[PDB]
């Protein structure tokens with residue numbers, strides 16, 4: 001019915017803006033920005049093979065061209081590149097080709113001589129050294145040379161360059177952070193994390209290097225001096241089982257509370273080519289509305305224009321539960337401020353952003369989010385460490401922000417960290433026993449069993465009749481036979497011929513009988529950083545998740561994914577398999593590149609920005625992996641043992657925000673276990689928490705060929721009855737859904753009364769309600785958006 005232009009040049013520009021807001025300047029003595037007309041020598045072999053993404057499902061976007069850093073600098077017309085040094089690298093690389101693997105964390109560095117380095121210095125004004133790292137799916141990052149540490153030849157390179165150049169810039173082309181101890185010690189003039197910026201990364205990076213854009217990126221994780229300083233390191237890296245003993249004390253929640261001196265760069269840290277002054281302003285609280293309102297003014301007090309981020313933190317009273325010193329509750333990035341100009345920033349913060357989950361009952365409100373009695377102090381500033389008192393208010397009694405239930409609780413006891421108040425008025429870590437679950441799972445499922453809809457194969461309503469409002473969804477679903485029900489819970493793929501070639505899955509109209517009811521085939525495709533088309537078809541490769549999050553700018557993120565929204569329609573992809581939004585529990589997790597933060601509020605807010613983007617033209621995202629997939633090693637069977645409180649405040653919280661702020665209507669579960677069973681068959685996760693408590697209205701799908709089990713039972717890839725009993729609606733994926741290619745147990749379990757028809761009907765109703773609002777339904781109804789690409 002309607003045509004829309006996808007302007008490719010504006011798509012490039014939107015993505016380019018994200019890159020130039022997401023680079024994080026850590027150190028600078030004034031060597032950056034690069035001066036007009038300067039000649040730069042670029043060191044590091046990885047300069048020729050810019051890491052545009054990490055590896056795995058989320059790093060297989062095909063493109064015709066990648067603008068690396070050298071090319072980005074030449075295109076700027078602000079500097080020139082030393083062409084002799086480039087040719088040394090190019091010629092060396094013909095003998096030492098880029099290893100593709102399985103793909104390694106890094107490439108072997110070219111050894112440098114005194115002659116090469118000395119001659120480059122004579123013919124250039126500044127050295128740029130690029131250190132490259134990638135990482136991803138199934139391969140965790142490791143505390144060794146070539147991975148988290150510099151390799152020996154990389155260190156040599158840096159020391160030579162330092163010696164022969166008095167102007168030296170180090171750039172980290174990395175998916176996740178690496179060791180900064182040796183780099184800091186070598187002490188370059190400027191240090192910037194440039195992440196992996198997709199196919200136009202070099203353009204946006206050139207913008208900040210040349211000063212066309214002033215750096216305004218901030219860290220989404222705390223950088224500590226050693227891997228052993230991180231509170232999760234003790235309990236990370238075990239393929240069988242890991243106890244989340246740090247509990248709520250993840251990242252800056254640990255460091256700012258217990259170990260300030262172990263931090264090199266705090267959460268939210270990043271600098272600019274200008275300087276800013278944050279002046280605390282008016283503060284009011286509204287206890288009856290459960291909000292406070294806080295103002296401050298940010299002023300550019302330096303000599304060049306730039307943006308800054310105002311970050312707001314709450315210190316809750318320790319009470320009986322114990323608390324982190326500071327938790328992030330709001331942030332706002334300024335517009336571009338000219339020298340001597342300023343911007344007033346006001347935030348309204350609901351109490352639920354700094355509530356605590358009582359999993360012991362010590363507050364008198366077990367299984368509730370609560371604010372304990374005491375003094376709440378609010379802080380504003382440039383990062384968590386440099387945040388200063390904005391206001392305060394005191395509660396004489398507990399406030400229950402929300403009543404919940406005992407759900408997804410641990411099945412075995414373990415000791416967790418506890419904030420303990422010393423005689424000094426300081427806080428130390430002590431340990432306490434996590435209570436074990438007393439939930440009767442059998443009874444919970446039976447007491448909440450949905451009502452069966454009597455089947456009726458004569459009255460043949462269409463899914464169009466449900467969409468129009470002509471009939472109830474219940475009235476429609478009655479025509480599905482047991483074959484139809486068994487079939488509709490199966491995703492078909494990879495590369496099902498019902499949808500665009502080379503994508504992840506088709507679902508909904510996966511049989512002739514389902515298609516006859518006007519259930520369309522809905523197409524899923526990886527990934528957060530752009531469409532992965534295994535046909536070889538090209539698509540936009542966008543910056544990695546961590547770079548997105550480092551913008552601290554929901555609007556710039558949403559703008560870019562508004563273009564992705566149209567591109568998906570163009571390719572007839574309805575469901576992009578992102579955002580990835582598992583918490584950065586440990587820096588060594590391989591997939592941190594396509595996730596956002598150690599902080600759940602930032603995590604959810606960035607995820608929600610992406611989803612709003614995709615929703616612009618009616619496309620959609622699938623939040624993943626729900627939940628606690630914070631480790632790649634052992635991910636087919638690993639058991640994350642974690643408290644309710646840690647789940648409610650940290651790991652689930654981002655996903656909750658995705659539902660309630662982001663309008664998320666599609667979730668993906670994990671390959672692994674949380675509290676002693678696989679996530680795909682967990683009732684508490686997929687029904688109790690997600691639907692009954694949060695009000696999610698949508699679909700849940702498995703991760704691709706994930707295992708499912710009943711608690712205590714053996715894991716398999718075809719226990720779909722366990723999956724449907726949990727209200728995980730879709731098994732992803734089978735070669736042929738109509739033929740039950742996986743030989744699943746849906747019908748045999750239904751035959752034996754161990755699976756109720758009502759449970760199948762519930763899943764089928766979720767699938768159909770989702771499917772009828774997709775662009776694939778619009779194509780059947782002939783009221784879809786037609787997209788045309790301009791600017792190529």
Ligand SMILES: O[C@@H]1[C@@H](O)[C@H](O)OC[C@H]1O
Nearest residue numbers: 057137526577624703704
């Ligand atoms: O993240 C998912 C990954 O775990 C799986 O292997 O492929 C599908 C992706 O969406």
